[PDB]
Design a protein around this ligand. Structure first.
Ligand SMILES: Nc1ncnc2c1ncn2[C@@H]1O[C@H](COP(=O)(O)OP(=O)(O)OP(O)(O)=S)[C@@H](O)[C@H]1O
Ligand SMILES: Nc1ncnc2c1ncn2[C@@H]1O[C@H](COP(=O)(O)OP(=O)(O)OP(O)(O)=S)[C@@H](O)[C@H]1O
Ligand SMILES: [Mg+2]
Ligand SMILES: [Mg+2]
Ligand SMILES: [Zn+2]
Ligand SMILES: [Zn+2]
Lengths: 366, 343, 364, 366, 215
């Protein structure tokens, strides 16, 4: 196997392929990238027995077909350390790979390519192309609500649902829920799948904001994503995701509208002195008035008051400041609408002018 | 605070479900059975969420407090389980438990497992806070006198027939180990679908006689069965049973025998057994030794036991098995040279 | 090459299993009646077949024909399990993987349904080496196990496991393989291996096995290697003699008959190899004590000393008790005086000479 | 105590005072900084029993004299969280402190000011003033060579030597040495002192590139630095430092002038595949050439060929790649004059353009 | 400030020591003939000058004038070693550095050449407190030390050391000082200090010394 390439054309695809790899792999082979030269094409593959990433590069110079496996981090460092605009020539000699760049020579150990695991082929069920912007919006909206480590595994992922001409992303962890939906302009059959945390992370990373459309294929238990010359394949978690519709309040009688920035600043100031162990705050809502209070076992109390658009009866309700701050950070809008019924019922948070994204927060016992 | 036994726990649960349940004792089998019954009843009532934590100095009480305070969108009716330290709660654990009891909700079902609490442990703020809304089930291993009743009941609830000889054999082979006895009963039921468990069947099952029963060797010594005692000692040596355990058991029995022998010169043996609360099944074999070994014996035996115990405490020698065999023949009616006793 | 007897003769069927009837019959009855429990544990001495029986049970559980006590051995599932490539059978070495992080990833796989089997079987070996956090994670998993998973455990130190773990599983204890069964198994193995053998060699190997089949197979392999592809009585006898080194018993016998030259020759032979003189004195004292106990009652001698049973019985029957007592006291005095002797060898020689030709004068 | 101060005028002094304070003071009083209002000034002091930092802020609003101790972290967070342009009014009531500003109120706990440790006075043997840039260059030329946690206590600090019309900074760890010299424009008596690494770091953070000269005073066992409204005091190690002249090779014959940029790039490329345990690489200094060969336990060859200005007989020498890379990074020059005497002797790595700075690197017997 | 007689009167020359004539003669002959070993071990009771002899040997080896059995005591190296701040003389307290990691770190730096002196001397004290792993790690390098390093070992319980370490070094055993020698040394010290004394007091002190001059 012999080929020659440019540093610029190889720096980015190599970084994308080697990004997922890290730590100590289950097997040494999983810690290496598979390089294949064939029909004037260089294919870089990286997998960890749960997901696969494939990148392709065009060759316009003499080359020899072949296949090998090489270390990821060391090869990436060697490629990055060379001067900009240099030419990298890769050759295979015995059980070694020789990399040449001007007067710089490197010899790297290799392993047989036959030992590299390969995922079995599968047939897709629903195929659809959408702009990267919509996927980025959905991910940034619904990522923060996923659970970190729970016995219920299906809550650790994100629920992607195709309904009519709409795509919806839902996340929850048993205490808070985030839902978003966007149109796609094409009719697709009703379907629902669960994506794991690592898959969502990789899908978010691979997006670059470019004009290249993202093509998504969903099958029985696998999902494939095409973006330019990058292909990402992942598996689907098995389970029954809870229905989000029942979570939403049926009839929230009391409504409130508040400035996002001022409310967020007030919440942060209240949380500065709030109990670190609990991070709990107490809200007193009255006619055109919202008061936030916090306290700690050291008898230090923090109080703040602000003016809002409210017309209901006075109420007292406890909350966890972390969830509210996360929701406010997610919603980047001038005004935020909060709908609630009582102190022991879930509160719904939405944008004043946009209803695409909604959040549900369960109040804390206080 | 209600107080119950494992048998009445099912009836209490059928009558109703209380906010908190306390499981204090030293019998893992009964505690596990009570926990399983309580969890099954709670799941029937609609408790599909369960949480368990271990109490220790390096404990994250913040997570427990957050779970108690935090609500659930759909998975309500939470269940929490605590495992107390073997020593028992301390002042820090006492105040942590008091705080946890302060933060209690109707949808949270609390279960606690640990050893029996002493008077000082019982007299705690958290313990008194739950007095009006708690039921404690006592779960401890029954003594040998009450063992055959439990064995018969367990066989009956499994739809099995046990003979008196089979029951006695099972009690003798698995005294103080109810888990092993239950496993043996289950294996016997598997072996014989008809469910008829005659004495030969259990005797064939007893062929295993894995280990951990030096009391059998000590009883053989007490009965004067030189052949049986020697055989059991050889089997224990093959099994690698801790010689220190054999030494301690024989030490307890030999001290009791020495006291009885010395104080029986003016009192009947049976009266002394009653004074010491000895078990009639033991009283027999003990009496045989007390009617088989003179005062010269049980003194050379005491000397040998003390020397071996000192050697194992200071030298930790592995030749203790030969000394145990010598002491075994000494405990029998064998004269012995008295030179092997280092005398 | 010829492979290893132990490796090539893994029991592939319940019939091939030697002994352990009380466990095999119970397992077969449970499989036939459908009474299958969530957690199974196996306990016993080394080389008793815990792992083999666990593998046989796993093969029987996930056979294509059905849940039967007699696996067909021809379907794809049986072949994969025998080769160890079965997807739904997860074998874990707890000794190698003890940290909680390693065990958590393996335990998290219970969420996925079986791919090509009725049950998802986990076979954990050396489970007694798991950490406290690993035990806690295992208990959490076993509290509410999925209906379509089974756990099999094998260890030689069940006491190490927490009582909570033990209480939630059914435990089977395996016994020894006796002697006749081991001899028959070795005879069958050698007949199938086309290796020449003699009955006396097989009997000696079975006697040296001491209830362990793995030890018996190792000794058979040693005899084959030393016998140049053949098993013979002379080869096995020489192999055992290389592991005997019975200089202590020979010294005791020579001393009891008052043969100084033999005592000196045996002392020189013992000094040829690295030996501890105090250990030799302790062994001689133990042998004398055992002889005295046997004289007091014939039942003192057990199966642990079956190798030298005849010599001990002859010594007990022949020597009067008084001579044994005198020799034991002399050896006790020698052991007491050994530390301050000019040399350990010199002290042992002096004590043996005193026992041979001298009698102490007791007070009064 | 009562005073109103502008937030901006108080931001930087608070950060400077909180800098030296560590995360774990091990004493409640240590974690709290001392605030003293007197006359028309406010003094903020922070000490950790080894170093002291004092800052002064002018006061224009009415106020009363007073002294107190307040937590550094909480006070700094409260000050920074307020909106820009806000005026903070701080008052002392009993054991509490009111930090009322605008619509926000806070109650910070306070401790007696008498319990705050103080440093005994000392006599200044030497006094001088130098520009900030010269001090920054001197410290940067030798900071990297200071030992981290060597058993030798005196090797954990930097040696400052004022001699004639110049000031010299020296650092070492027993394997590598760094020396820098700069004129000061004023004659001072010969003197040598040792400063701990923490003091050097604090001095570096103190500098901001301002035009105000830095005034340095040195006593028997103490050092003081004054710049603007900031004063810093530190103790001295009070130990011996090996003489650099003896460590410096004497009249080395080889004077290899290497291409600092490509030289360091090649060194990094070799270090990519170098022995991780020892970080050692073989430099084959050939005629007007250098071959940096790196070999790791994986036996992956990292021979890199570069053009240098060597003119002597070719020589092989083993060097720790990390030390060489650090020296090249610190040089920040065009050509590096490695002056070599022999393979086993140390190499004097100097800046070819500037002879003021120098380093000494010891080889290894590979 | 004030220093006790034991610290003040530590010998600084081979002629200032008491007894141990055989050890001094052997060391002098070895230095004169040029036959210098790479591993020296000193054994004996307490307070017999093992550390002092090791320090004197270290001074002699690294003296500026040359390898001589009579150090000048005036050059920079001699003064630095006497004052206990010599760079190339590394003193290890094995009683507090028993960790194998410390030994490995120390061995990793042997390849570097000495800074000033012609040899890099390691003086390990109370070596009997080192762990088995430390001894095993030492074994290999002690068998093949570079040409520019030396090892000096001082021990009071040589029995604990393994035979492998013992066979890799030249052993010197120090004889306990006699009562007459202790009395003479005490008399000389008192005469040098100009302190009144009586023969019976010196005899009693020597008898109570029990072979230890430090006592
Ligand atoms: N019951 C048995 N029947 C036939 N061969 C057996 C039996 N037990 C052991 N063997 C032989 O011994 C070998 C090893 O048996 P194992 O099952 O690995 O021993 P073991 O009981 O698992 O000991 P552990 O648990 O690893 S300490 C097998 O491959 C057989 O050759
Ligand atoms: N041979 C000696 N000649 C002169 N003074 C000696 C001698 N031995 C001991 N001393 C005195 O006793 C002090 C202690 O001697 P050391 O050098 O510590 O002997 P030591 O054998 O190393 O003691 P240990 O092993 O460290 S307890 C010295 O400073 C002298 O004052
Ligand atoms: Mg096994
Ligand atoms: Mg000393
Ligand atoms: Zn099959
Ligand atoms: Zn000198």
């Amino acid at each position: 196997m012999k080929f020659t390439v440019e540093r610029e054309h190889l720096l980015k695809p190599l970084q994308q392929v080697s990004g997922p790899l890290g730590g100590r792999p289950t097997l040494p082979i999983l810690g290496n990238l598979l390089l294949q030269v064939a029909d004037g094409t260089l294919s870089l593959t990286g997998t960890d027995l749960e997901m696969e990433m494939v990148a392709r590069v065009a060759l316009v110079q003499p080359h020899e077909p072949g296949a090998t496996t090489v270390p990821a981090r060391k090869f990436f460092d060697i490629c990055r350390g060379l001067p900009e605009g240099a030419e990298i020539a890769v050759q295979l000699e015995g059980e070694r790979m020789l990399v040449r760049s001007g007067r710089s020579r490197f010899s790297l150990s290799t392993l047989p390519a036959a030992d590299f695991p390969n995922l079995d082929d599968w047939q897709s069920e629903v195929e659809f192309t959408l702009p990267q912007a919509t996927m980025k919006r959905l991910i940034e909206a619904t990522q923060f609500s996923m659970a970190h480590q729970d016995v219920r595994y299906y809550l650790n992922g994100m629920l992607f649902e195709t309904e009519g001409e709409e795509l919806r992303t839902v996340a929850t962890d048993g205490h808070r829920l985030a839902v978003c939906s966007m149109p796609i302009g094409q009719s697709l059959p009703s379907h629902s799948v669960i994506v794991p945390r690592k898959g969502v992370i990789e899908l978010m990373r691979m997006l670059d904001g470019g004009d290249n459309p993202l093509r998504v294929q969903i099958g029985s238990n696998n999902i494939r994503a095409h973006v330019g010359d990058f292909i990402f394949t992942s598996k689907l978690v098995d389970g029954r995701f809870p229905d989000y519709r029942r979570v939403l309040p049926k009839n929230p009688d009391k409504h409130l509208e508040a400035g996002c920035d001022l409310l967020k600043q007030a919440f942060a100031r209240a949380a500065i002195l709030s109990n670190e162990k609990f991070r709990g705050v107490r809200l007193y809502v009255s006619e055109n008035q919202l008061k936030i209070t916090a306290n700690n076992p050291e008898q230090e109390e923090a109080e703040e008051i602000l003016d809002v658009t409210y017309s209901g009866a006075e109420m007292e309700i406890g909350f966890n400041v972390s969830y509210v701050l996360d929701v406010l950070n997610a919603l980047k809008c001038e005004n935020v609408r909060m709908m609630l019924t009582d102190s022991v019922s879930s509160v719904q948070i939405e944008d004043a002018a946009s209803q695409s994204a909604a959040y549900v927060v369960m109040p804390m016992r206080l | 605070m209600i107080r119950l036994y494992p048998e009445q726990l099912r009836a209490q649960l059928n009558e109703g479900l209380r906010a908190a349940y306390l499981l204090l004792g030293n019998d893992p089998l009964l505690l596990q059975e009570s926990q399983d019954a309580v969890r099954q009843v709670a799941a029937a009532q609609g408790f599909e969420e369960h949480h368990t934590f271990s109490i220790d100095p390096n404990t994250d009480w913040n997570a427990i407090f957050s779970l108690c305070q935090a609500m659930s969108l759909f998975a309500s009716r939470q269940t929490l389980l605590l495992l107390l330290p073997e020593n028992g709660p301390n002042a820090a654990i006492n105040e942590q438990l008091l705080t946890l009891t302060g933060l209690l909700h109707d949808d949270l079902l609390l279960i606690v497992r640990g050893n029996k609490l002493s008077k000082a442990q019982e007299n705690a703020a958290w313990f008194t806070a739950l007095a009006n809304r708690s039921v404690q089930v006592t779960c401890q291993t029954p003594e040998q006198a009450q063992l055959p009743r439990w064995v018969a009941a367990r066989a009956k609830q499994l739809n099995l027939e046990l003979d008196d000889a089979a029951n006695q054999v099972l009690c003798y082979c698995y005294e103080g180990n109810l888990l092993a006895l239950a496993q043996a009963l289950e294996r016997l039921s598997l072996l014989w679908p008809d469910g008829k468990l005659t004495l030969p069947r259990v005797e064939q099952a007893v062929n295993d006689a894995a280990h951990f029963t030096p009391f059998h060797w000590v009883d053989a010594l007490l009965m004067g069965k030189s052949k049986r005692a020697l055989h059991i000692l050889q089997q224990l040596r093959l099994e690698g049973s801790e010689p220190v355990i054999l030494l301690r058991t024989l030490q307890r029995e030999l001290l009791l025998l020495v006291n009885l022998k010395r104080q029986s010169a003016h009192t009947p043996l049976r009266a002394l057994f009653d004074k010491h609360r000895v078990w009639q099944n033991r009283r027999g074999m003990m009496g045989e030794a007390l009617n088989r070994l003179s005062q010269t014996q049980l003194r050379q035996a005491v000397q040998l036991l003390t020397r071996t115990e000192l050697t194992l405490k200071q030298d930790y020698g592995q030749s203790v098995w030969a000394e145990l065999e010598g002491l075994s023949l000494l405990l029998c009616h064998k004269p012995l040279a008295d030179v092997f006793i280092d005398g | 090459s010829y492979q290893v007897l132990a490796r090539k003769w893994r029991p592939q069927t319940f019939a091939d299993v030697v002994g352990q009837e009380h466990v095999l019959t119970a397992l077969a009855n449970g499989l036939s009646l459908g009474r299958i429990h969530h957690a199974y544990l196996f306990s016993g001495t080394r080389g008793v077949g815990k792992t083999s029986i666990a593998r046989l049970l796993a093969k029987g559980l996930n056979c294509e024909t059905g849940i039967t006590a007699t696996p067909c051995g021809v379907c794809d599932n049986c072949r994969e399990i025998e080769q160890g490539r079965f997807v739904d059978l997860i074998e874990i070495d707890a000794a190698s993987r003890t940290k909680v992080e390693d065990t958590r990833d393996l335990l998290d796989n219970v969420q996925y349904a079986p791919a090509r089997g009725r049950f998802k079987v986990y076979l954990i070996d050396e489970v007694h080496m798991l950490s406290r956090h690993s035990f806690n994670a295992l208990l959490k998993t076993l509290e509410e196990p999925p209906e379509h998973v089974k756990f099999l455990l094998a260890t030689t130190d069940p006491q190490k496991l927490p009582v909570t773990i033990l209480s939630r599983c059914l435990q089977f204890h395996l016994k020894a393989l006796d002697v006749e069964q081991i001899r028959h198994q070795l005879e069958h193995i050698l007949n199938e291996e086309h290796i020449a053998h003699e009955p006396r060699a097989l009997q000696l190997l079975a006697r040296a096995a001491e209830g362990s089949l793995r030890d018996a197979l190792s000794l058979t392999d040693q005899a084959i290697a030393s016998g140049d592809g053949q098993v013979s009585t002379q080869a096995v006898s020489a192999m055992l003699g290389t592991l005997d080194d019975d200089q202590a018993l020979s010294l005791v016998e020579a001393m009891v008959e008052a043969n100084g030259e033999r005592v000196m020759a045996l002392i020189n032979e013992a000094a040829a190899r690295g030996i501890e003189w105090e250990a030799l004195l302790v062994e001689m004292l133990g042998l004398l004590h055992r002889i005295a106990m046997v004289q007091l009652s014939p039942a003192a001698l057990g199966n642990d000393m079956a190798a030298i049973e005849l010599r001990m019985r002859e010594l007990a029957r022949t020597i009067p008790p008084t001579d044994i007592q005198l020799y034991y006291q002399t050896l006790l005095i020698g052991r007491k005086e050994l530390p301050y002797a000019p040399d350990r060898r010199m002290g042992v020689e002096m004590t043996l000479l005193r026992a041979l030709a001298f009698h102490p004068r007791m007070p009064l």
